Amino acid sequence: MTTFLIKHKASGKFLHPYGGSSNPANNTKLVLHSDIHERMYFQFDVVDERWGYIKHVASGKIVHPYGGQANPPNETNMVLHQDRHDRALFAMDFFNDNIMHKGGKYIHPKGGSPNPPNNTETVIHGDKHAAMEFIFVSPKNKDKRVLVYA
Numbered sequence: 001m002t003t004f005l006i007k008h009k010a011s012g013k014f015l016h017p018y019g020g021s022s023n024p025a026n027n028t029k030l031v032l033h034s035d036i037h038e039r040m041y042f043q044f045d046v047v048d049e050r051w052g053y054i055k056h057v058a059s060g061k062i063v064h065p066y067g068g069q070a071n072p073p074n075e076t077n078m079v080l081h082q083d084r085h086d087r088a089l090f091a092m093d094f095f096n097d098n099i100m101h102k103g104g105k106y107i108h109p110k111g112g113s114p115n116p117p118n119n120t121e122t123v124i125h126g127d128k129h130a131a132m133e134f135i136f137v138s139p140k141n142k143d144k145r146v147l148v149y150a
Contacts, residue, residue: 003041004146008032009097009133010114016040017080022058030078031119032109041139044148050091056080064088065124071103076124092148097133108132
């Protein structure tokens with residue numbers, strides 16, 4: 001199914017598991033990093049119309065708010081975990097360019113910087129601004145948007 005990079009729009013860095021492993025342990029944090037390789041490729045498993053799991057290709061683990069809450073508060077870390085459940089549902093809003101968790105909050109770089117350094121953690125946060133925007137691009141062309149829903 002269609003593979004993509006999650007690119008932070010303001011800085012051009014990508015979502016990675018911290019340490020870049022092909023098999024990250026449960027609860028490894030998701031960070032921003034400039035490197036491109038097969039261990040930062042993602043896919044999107046549609047569950048219910050806009051909602052689905054954001055899946056790390058190399059390991060098959062998916063994105064979760066740490067602790068798996070329905071309504072994680074601001075600053076909750078994004079991590080990878082093997083479990084599938086409704087608290088790991090996100091919508092990939094490719095029109096407003098953001099990623100929304102089921103509870104209504106978004107993925108941010110921690111600190112909200114438009115230029116986070118390599119290995120900055122990502123967190124849940126309710127705010128909307130230029131620095132929490134993400135676009136979904138081809139592994140072979142980091143400037144070409146791809147359709148994550150098909």
